[PDB]
Design an enzyme around this catalytic site. Structure first.
Site, PDB file in Angstrom:
ATOM      1  N   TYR A  88       0.739  -1.166   0.000  1.00 45.60           N
ATOM      2  CA  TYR A  88       0.000   0.000   0.000  1.00 45.60           C
ATOM      3  C   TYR A  88       0.841   1.327   0.000  1.00 45.60           C
ATOM      4  O   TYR A  88       1.800   1.414   0.765  1.00 45.60           O
ATOM      5  CB  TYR A  88      -0.938  -0.050   1.224  1.00 45.60           C
ATOM      6  CG  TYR A  88      -1.883   1.106   1.236  1.00 45.60           C
ATOM      7  CD1 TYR A  88      -1.541   2.369   1.777  1.00 45.60           C
ATOM      8  CD2 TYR A  88      -3.118   0.954   0.610  1.00 45.60           C
ATOM      9  CE1 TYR A  88      -2.407   3.408   1.756  1.00 45.60           C
ATOM     10  CE2 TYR A  88      -4.030   2.032   0.586  1.00 45.60           C
ATOM     11  CZ  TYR A  88      -3.634   3.255   1.115  1.00 45.60           C
ATOM     12  OH  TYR A  88      -4.563   4.322   1.118  1.00 45.60           O
ATOM     13  N   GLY A  89       0.440   2.280  -0.829  1.00 46.84           N
ATOM     14  CA  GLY A  89       0.784   3.628  -0.664  1.00 46.84           C
ATOM     15  C   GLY A  89       2.227   3.960  -0.382  1.00 46.84           C
ATOM     16  O   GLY A  89       3.168   3.512  -1.077  1.00 46.84           O
TER      17      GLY A  89
ATOM     18  N   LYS B 170       7.434   8.796   0.046  1.00 50.91           N
ATOM     19  CA  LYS B 170       7.808   9.180   1.412  1.00 50.91           C
ATOM     20  C   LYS B 170       9.181   8.647   1.750  1.00 50.91           C
ATOM     21  O   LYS B 170       9.987   9.370   2.319  1.00 50.91           O
ATOM     22  CB  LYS B 170       6.788   8.694   2.438  1.00 50.91           C
ATOM     23  CG  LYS B 170       5.376   9.223   2.266  1.00 50.91           C
ATOM     24  CD  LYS B 170       5.274  10.759   2.173  1.00 50.91           C
ATOM     25  CE  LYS B 170       3.823  11.200   2.192  1.00 50.91           C
ATOM     26  NZ  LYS B 170       3.492  12.640   2.190  1.00 50.91           N
TER      27      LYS B 170
ATOM     28  N   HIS C 166       7.711  18.287   3.294  1.00 52.67           N
ATOM     29  CA  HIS C 166       6.322  17.893   3.056  1.00 52.67           C
ATOM     30  C   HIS C 166       5.495  19.103   2.747  1.00 52.67           C
ATOM     31  O   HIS C 166       4.665  19.559   3.524  1.00 52.67           O
ATOM     32  CB  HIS C 166       5.839  17.163   4.320  1.00 52.67           C
ATOM     33  CG  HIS C 166       4.535  16.458   4.193  1.00 52.67           C
ATOM     34  ND1 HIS C 166       3.771  16.201   5.294  1.00 52.67           N
ATOM     35  CD2 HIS C 166       3.885  15.841   3.118  1.00 52.67           C
ATOM     36  CE1 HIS C 166       2.700  15.469   4.929  1.00 52.67           C
ATOM     37  NE2 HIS C 166       2.749  15.264   3.586  1.00 52.67           N
TER      38      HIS C 166
ATOM     39  N   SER D  63      -0.589  15.955   7.147  1.00 49.54           N
ATOM     40  CA  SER D  63      -1.614  15.159   6.552  1.00 49.54           C
ATOM     41  C   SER D  63      -2.963  15.474   7.198  1.00 49.54           C
ATOM     42  O   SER D  63      -3.032  15.836   8.404  1.00 49.54           O
ATOM     43  CB  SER D  63      -1.217  13.648   6.622  1.00 49.54           C
ATOM     44  OG  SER D  63       0.179  13.390   6.344  1.00 49.54           O
ATOM     45  N   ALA D  64      -4.058  15.462   6.424  1.00 53.12           N
ATOM     46  CA  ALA D  64      -5.333  15.761   6.825  1.00 53.12           C
ATOM     47  C   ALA D  64      -5.690  17.270   7.119  1.00 53.12           C
ATOM     48  O   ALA D  64      -6.739  17.625   7.601  1.00 53.12           O
ATOM     49  CB  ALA D  64      -5.777  14.813   7.956  1.00 53.12           C
ATOM     50  N   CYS D  65      -4.771  18.171   6.686  1.00 51.53           N
ATOM     51  CA  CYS D  65      -4.922  19.582   6.955  1.00 51.53           C
ATOM     52  C   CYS D  65      -4.936  20.384   5.665  1.00 51.53           C
ATOM     53  O   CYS D  65      -4.897  21.595   5.730  1.00 51.53           O
ATOM     54  CB  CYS D  65      -3.792  20.055   7.913  1.00 51.53           C
ATOM     55  SG  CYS D  65      -3.892  19.315   9.513  1.00 51.53           S
ATOM     56  N   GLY D  66      -5.092  19.738   4.508  1.00 53.11           N
ATOM     57  CA  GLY D  66      -5.491  20.445   3.309  1.00 53.11           C
ATOM     58  C   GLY D  66      -4.436  20.891   2.363  1.00 53.11           C
ATOM     59  O   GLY D  66      -4.725  21.841   1.553  1.00 53.11           O
TER      60      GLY D  66
ATOM     61  N   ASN E 275      -5.902  20.645  -1.291  1.00 58.13           N
ATOM     62  CA  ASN E 275      -6.948  21.671  -1.556  1.00 58.13           C
ATOM     63  C   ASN E 275      -6.297  22.984  -1.941  1.00 58.13           C
ATOM     64  O   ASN E 275      -6.795  23.695  -2.819  1.00 58.13           O
ATOM     65  CB  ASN E 275      -7.870  21.892  -0.393  1.00 58.13           C
ATOM     66  CG  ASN E 275      -8.493  20.610   0.087  1.00 58.13           C
ATOM     67  OD1 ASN E 275      -7.877  19.875   0.834  1.00 58.13           O
ATOM     68  ND2 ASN E 275      -9.696  20.327  -0.356  1.00 58.13           N
TER      69      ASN E 275
ATOM     70  N   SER F  44      -8.510   6.533   1.888  1.00 63.55           N
ATOM     71  CA  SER F  44      -8.508   6.111   0.509  1.00 63.55           C
ATOM     72  C   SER F  44      -7.967   7.204  -0.398  1.00 63.55           C
ATOM     73  O   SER F  44      -8.025   8.395  -0.060  1.00 63.55           O
ATOM     74  CB  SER F  44      -9.914   5.640   0.083  1.00 63.55           C
ATOM     75  OG  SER F  44     -10.923   6.619   0.299  1.00 63.55           O
TER      76      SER F  44
ATOM     77  N   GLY G 208     -11.747  27.893  -1.597  1.00 58.89           N
ATOM     78  CA  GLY G 208     -11.326  28.948  -2.509  1.00 58.89           C
ATOM     79  C   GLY G 208     -11.309  30.350  -1.904  1.00 58.89           C
ATOM     80  O   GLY G 208     -10.642  31.241  -2.451  1.00 58.89           O
TER      81      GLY G 208
HETATM   82  N1  LIG Z   1     -12.445  23.895   7.140  1.00 58.25           N
HETATM   83  C1  LIG Z   1     -11.554  23.649   6.144  1.00 58.25           C
HETATM   84  N2  LIG Z   1     -11.164  22.412   5.898  1.00 58.25           N
HETATM   85  C2  LIG Z   1     -10.254  22.290   4.921  1.00 58.25           C
HETATM   86  C3  LIG Z   1      -9.718  23.334   4.152  1.00 58.25           C
HETATM   87  N3  LIG Z   1      -8.834  22.810   3.243  1.00 58.25           N
HETATM   88  C4  LIG Z   1      -8.835  21.512   3.494  1.00 58.25           C
HETATM   89  N4  LIG Z   1      -9.696  21.163   4.492  1.00 58.25           N
HETATM   90  C5  LIG Z   1      -9.889  19.833   5.037  1.00 58.25           C
HETATM   91  O1  LIG Z   1      -8.676  19.122   4.883  1.00 58.25           O
HETATM   92  C6  LIG Z   1      -8.976  17.681   4.663  1.00 58.25           C
HETATM   93  C7  LIG Z   1      -8.374  17.227   3.361  1.00 58.25           C
HETATM   94  O2  LIG Z   1      -6.956  17.334   3.469  1.00 58.25           O
HETATM   95  P1  LIG Z   1      -6.019  16.120   3.010  1.00 58.25           P
HETATM   96  O3  LIG Z   1      -6.162  15.853   1.561  1.00 58.25           O
HETATM   97  O4  LIG Z   1      -6.141  14.971   3.924  1.00 58.25           O
HETATM   98  O5  LIG Z   1      -4.651  16.889   3.340  1.00 58.25           O
HETATM   99  P2  LIG Z   1      -3.175  16.821   2.700  1.00 58.25           P
HETATM  100  O6  LIG Z   1      -2.413  17.872   3.392  1.00 58.25           O
HETATM  101  O7  LIG Z   1      -3.249  16.894   1.214  1.00 58.25           O
HETATM  102  O8  LIG Z   1      -2.717  15.350   3.179  1.00 58.25           O
HETATM  103  P3  LIG Z   1      -1.694  14.232   2.549  1.00 58.25           P
HETATM  104  O9  LIG Z   1      -2.124  14.054   1.102  1.00 58.25           O
HETATM  105  O10 LIG Z   1      -1.961  13.026   3.422  1.00 58.25           O
HETATM  106  O11 LIG Z   1      -0.322  14.847   2.722  1.00 58.25           O
HETATM  107  C8  LIG Z   1     -10.495  17.562   4.655  1.00 58.25           C
HETATM  108  O12 LIG Z   1     -10.960  17.284   5.984  1.00 58.25           O
HETATM  109  C9  LIG Z   1     -10.864  18.983   4.256  1.00 58.25           C
HETATM  110  O13 LIG Z   1     -12.233  19.339   4.531  1.00 58.25           O
HETATM  111  C10 LIG Z   1     -10.175  24.669   4.457  1.00 58.25           C
HETATM  112  O14 LIG Z   1      -9.846  25.694   3.828  1.00 58.25           O
HETATM  113  N5  LIG Z   1     -11.092  24.709   5.457  1.00 58.25           N
HETATM  114  O1  LIG Z   2       0.354   9.948   1.434  1.00 57.73           O
HETATM  115  C1  LIG Z   2       0.572  11.101   1.985  1.00 57.73           C
HETATM  116  O2  LIG Z   2       0.653  12.210   1.281  1.00 57.73           O
HETATM  117  C2  LIG Z   2       0.700  11.267   3.455  1.00 57.73           C
HETATM  118  O3  LIG Z   2       0.480  10.237   4.188  1.00 57.73           O
HETATM  119  O4  LIG Z   2       1.067  12.378   3.939  1.00 57.73           O
HETATM  120 MN   LIG Z   3       1.580  13.797   2.368  1.00 52.20          MN
END
Ligand SMILES: Nc1nc2c(ncn2[C@@H]2O[C@H](COP(=O)(O)OP(=O)(O)OP(=O)(O)O)[C@@H](O)[C@H]2O)c(=O)[nH]1
Ligand SMILES: O=C([O-])C(=O)[O-]
Ligand SMILES: [Mn+2]
Ligand SMILES: [Mn+2]
Ligand SMILES: [Mn+2]
Ligand code: NA
Length: 610
Positions: A233-234, A242, A262, A284-287, A290, A402, A519
């Site tokens: 996986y991944g 990574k 990162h 990770s998980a902080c956008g 986006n 996923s 945006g």
């Molecule tokens: N409230 C809010 N949530 C956001 C924003 N941008 C992203 N998110 C949240 O961020 C999460 C998606 O971020 P991920 O794709 O996991 O973040 P990443 O930094 O690309 O993570 P990795 O790909 O694992 O490195 C979701 O919970 C989104 O809703 C924002 O401007 N506001």
């Molecule tokens: O896969 C990724 O981008 C991670 O885990 O940060």
């Molecule tokens: Mn990452």
């Protein structure tokens, strides 16, 4: 070069030739073939015919499904034991533990995991001999970075997984041209196996070969080796990403004077046509993804994506911090991706994309939590666990982390310079994470040293520290990483980027986000851009500079509570500083640089005067 017939593996090559490999690549391949005992050796060429045929082969074996709604898109559903990186099984081998991680005053380190050379040797011997019996060993020659770039670095990954070959084709540049570019040069040695030699000793689940009990993702920076066993996986199997481009590369970067981070990289163009590049580290998980692909709401602005996840940055002859994206694709989190949150990703992933662990609709499309779009009546869903599913159900239709795996050259807003070999000149670095309380939408660091401290103080959630977004990824001791970042201030002629910290996630008293984000974050980027140009748009506060009243464009957002989003409480910041002090002492202690301690005390002092 043998008394018998078991050393020269020429007879088992089914694509390419061992004789046409550079000598050291042949040695790597043959040595590992002797060890792992594959049936077949396939030297990848990176061609579309190779890729098509290998997808069709996986499809025939039941390993992936074609997604009939889209153009050449595919779905893999894993064994639910395999589904993510596993930190406890991810290790770095060095002669001394302290070179890899600081010694924490108590507990275990949150900042990495060391294994001794001795223990690794035992672990390796218990796993790799014979591990590829009955399978094909694929030889993947890949470039991290634009092919031939002075900032790019080449690897060779051996794997027994077709899934890994397909995914590496998307996420890296791979194939014969890489071997040609490599010639007799150095490369990172990457060895991977799913750990399931034939005949299978244990039941295959979901047509997904893996060995969870023996899974181990090891990094040997002083041997320039990455050795990963047991996970398909991944980040555990796609070894460029990574393992190479953060953990190995960060160690190399420290020794050689550059940075492996990162970070997304984006280009932002104002309505007057002036363009700047920014890099941003969010956990990770902080956008990151986006932001990297943002569709800006402000009229007249443009955002273009250079990369969404990893940046390699090196000061050039003129002192510009040049960045490249060492990846070739986006390996993005699927859940939460919608037209509202990432319309450019939605566009990107409808062709030539591999999805892993998402749901499939009865018309051959994809689905996940947060997709925020309805299906026609009659359209049904198969979850990622291959079961019928409806929205009322207790568990999600897609695994929470996923992924899609999509070509970067696809992205409708890919930046024109995303493969320029010299890299793009970074003028701002953004840190940020999830802070539900206390932390304003945006602030600007007072100095480089203050900015390094701000990176060190980042959180992935209210509770959890993730300095520089690198907590799972440091290639060496985080104190020494801090010293390395601080040393950049002493590089003569360096054009040090301005450092910002953002917070998209501050919540009001009811738990509602105070900022609409996505945006709308273009409004914060506009403020950063003017600050880089020297605009007098900042007010000094204890924590750094914040926007002046009326400096942010809030047109279209009159329901925003500005005082609350922008508030700085002595009480909150007193506790923040104490928490930072305790975290750094506990996790970094003897390796904490002078200048970080000094920034902590300076912040404490400024707060004391509120
Ligand atoms: N409230 C809010 N949530 C956001 C924003 N941008 C992203 N998110 C949240 O961020 C999460 C998606 O971020 P991920 O794709 O996991 O973040 P990443 O930094 O690309 O993570 P990795 O790909 O694992 O490195 C979701 O919970 C989104 O809703 C924002 O401007 N506001
Ligand atoms: O896969 C990724 O981008 C991670 O885990 O940060
Ligand atoms: Mn990452
Ligand atoms: Mn078969
Ligand atoms: Mn991402
Ligand atoms: Na499967």
């Amino acid at each position: 070069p043998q008394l018998h017939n078991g050393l020269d593996f020429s007879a088992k090559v089914i694509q390419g030739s061992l004789d046409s490999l550079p000598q050291e690549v042949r040695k790597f391949v043959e040595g590992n073939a002797q060890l792992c005992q594959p049936e077949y050796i396939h030297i990848c060429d990176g061609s579309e015919e190779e890729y098509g045929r290998l997808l069709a082969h996986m499809q025939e074996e039941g390993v992936i499904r074609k997604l009939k709604k889209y153009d050449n898109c595919w779905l893999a559903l894993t064994d639910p034991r395999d589904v993510a990186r596993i930190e406890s099984k991810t290790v770095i081998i060095t002669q001394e533990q302290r070179d890899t991680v600081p010694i924490p005053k108590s507990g275990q380190s949150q900042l990495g995991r060391w294994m001794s050379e001795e223990d690794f040797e035992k672990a390796f011997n218990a796993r790799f001999p014979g591990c590829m019996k009955g399978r094909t060993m694929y030889v993947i020659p890949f470039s991290m970075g634009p092919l031939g770039s002075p900032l790019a670095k080449i690897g060779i990954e051996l794997t027994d997984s077709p899934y890994v070959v397909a995914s590496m084709r998307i996420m890296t540049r791979m194939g014969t041209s890489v071997l040609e570019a490599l010639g007799d040069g150095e490369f990172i040695k990457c060895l991977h196996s799913v750990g399931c030699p034939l005949p299978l000793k244990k039941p295959l689940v979901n047509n997904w070969a893996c060995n969870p009990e023996l899974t181990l993702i090891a990094h040997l920076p002083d041997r320039r080796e990455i050795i990963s066993f047991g996970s398909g996986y991944g980040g555990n199997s796609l070894l460029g990403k990574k393992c190479f481009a953060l953990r190995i590369a960060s160690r190399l970067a420290k020794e050689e004077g550059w940075l492996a981070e990162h970070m997304l990289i984006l280009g932002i163009t104002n309505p007057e046509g002036k363009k700047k590049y920014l890099a941003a580290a969010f956990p990770s998980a902080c956008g990151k993804t986006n932001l990297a692909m943002m569709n800006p709401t402000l009229p007249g602005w443009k955002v273009e994506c250079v990369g969404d996840d990893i940046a390699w940055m090196k000061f050039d002859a003129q002192g510009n911090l040049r960045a490249i994206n060492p990846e070739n694709g986006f390996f993005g989190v699927a859940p939460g991706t919608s037209v509202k949150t990432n319309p450019n990703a939605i566009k990107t992933i409808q062709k030539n994309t591999i999805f892993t662990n998402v749901a499939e609709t009865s018309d051959g499309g994809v689905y996940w939590e947060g997709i925020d779009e309805p299906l026609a009546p009659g359209v049904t869903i198969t979850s990622w666990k291959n079961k019928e599913w409806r929205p009322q159900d207790e568990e999600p239709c897609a695994h929470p982390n996923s992924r899609f795996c999509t070509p970067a050259s696809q992205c409708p807003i890919i930046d024109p310079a995303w493969e320029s070999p010299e890299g793009v000149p970074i003028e701002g670095i953004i840190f940020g994470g999830r802070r539900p309380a206390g932390v304003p939408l945006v602030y600007e660091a007072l100095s480089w040293q203050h900015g390094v401290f701000v990176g060190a103080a980042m959180r992935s959630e209210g509770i959890m520290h993730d300095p520089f977004a690198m907590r799972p990824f440091f290639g060496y001791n985080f104190g020494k990483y801090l010293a390395h970042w601080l040393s950049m201030a002493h590089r003569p002629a360096a054009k040090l980027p301005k450092i910002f910290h953002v917070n998209w996630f501050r919540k009001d008293k009811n738990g509602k986000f105070l900022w609409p984000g996505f945006g709308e974050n273009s409004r914060v980027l506009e403020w950063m851009f003017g600050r880089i140009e020297g605009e007098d748009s900042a007010k000094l506060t204890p924590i750094g500079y914040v926007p002046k009243e009326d400096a942010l464009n809030l047109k279209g957002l009159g329901d925003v509570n500005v005082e609350e989003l922008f508030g700085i409480s002595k009480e909150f910041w007193e506790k923040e500083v104490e928490e930072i002090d305790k975290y750094l002492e506990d996790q970094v202690n003897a390796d904490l640089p002078y200048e970080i301690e000094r920034e902590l005390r300076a912040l404490k002092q400024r707060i004391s005067q509120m």
